[PDB]
């Protein structure tokens, strides 16, 4: 899993 | 309490819907799955795995769950209205704490076991992680939480309050978040009063530091993946 911490939340929030 | 009684009852229901919709597995299914427990051969299978391999699997599961927590946040009445800086700040500080609450929620006190990858298993299942001090404290937190018997609605409101906390450093719209938090405290307070369980939050242990550590391990693996085997 390359994306983690704040980077995964940012990606997750875009929706 | 200026808010009318009917308006608060809806806020309870809206928050519970968001929690139930966004759990990875429905609680009712979790209780029904308590019968199937990993076989001693399956357990040893997990123990044979290399520290990295078991951490790599566990960290992916923490990140998957985080993603479902972000969805929970989106469903909160006022979360979308907040500026993206604030939306991100609240999720950085709190989203891992919710995760631990949701995973520790899928636990069985009778035989001290946790739902993990399809079947229930005990603390011994995690020996490959090699942080027994962390694993025993996490299982303790889960056992204490089980004693309190939180309902889905009580667990939905409490996790909601963890995310929507107005004291996190770096919030731009502090006042806007306090208003959203207060409304959740009003709601939750009413629900505890109706059921005579005002004292339950005092008895819950703090999971903040445990989650801080879990986040540190998740980050550790992403910083160092080039030194470990490829996906
Ligand atoms: C016993 O307490 C523990 C808590 C967490 C853990 C735990 C996990 C879990 N990964 C899953 C993956 C999974 O089965 N997902 C489906 C569930 C998710 C929760 O909601 C119900 C469906 C469940 S646990 C990953 N890392 N850790 C640490 C030990 C590092 C912390 C272990 C043990």
Residue numbers in the entry:
A (entry chain B): 2346 to 2360
B (entry chain A): 263 to 493
Provide excerpts from the study:
As no crystals grew under the previous reservoir conditions for the RORγ-LBD, rockogenin crystals were soaked with compound T and CoR peptide. Extensive interactions of compound T with RORγ-LBD include a direct hydrogen-bonding and van der Waals (VdW) contacts. Compound T is found to reduce efficacy in the FRET-based CoR recruitment assay. This ternary complex structure reveals the structural mechanism for the decreased CoR recruitment activity of RORγ in the presence of compound T when compared to compound A. The complex structure shows that the binding of compound T induces a movement of helix 5 (H5) that resulted in a decreased interaction interface between CoR peptide and the binding groove of RORγ-LBD. The observed N-terminus region upstream from Glu2351 is unwound and Leu2350 backbone shifts approximately 2 Å outwards from RORγ-LBD. Compound T induces the dislocated N-terminus of CoR peptide in a binding mode that will induce less interaction with hRORγ-LBD than that with compound A.
Orally available small-molecule inhibitors of RORγ have been created as a substitute medication for injectable biologics, which impose burdens to patients.
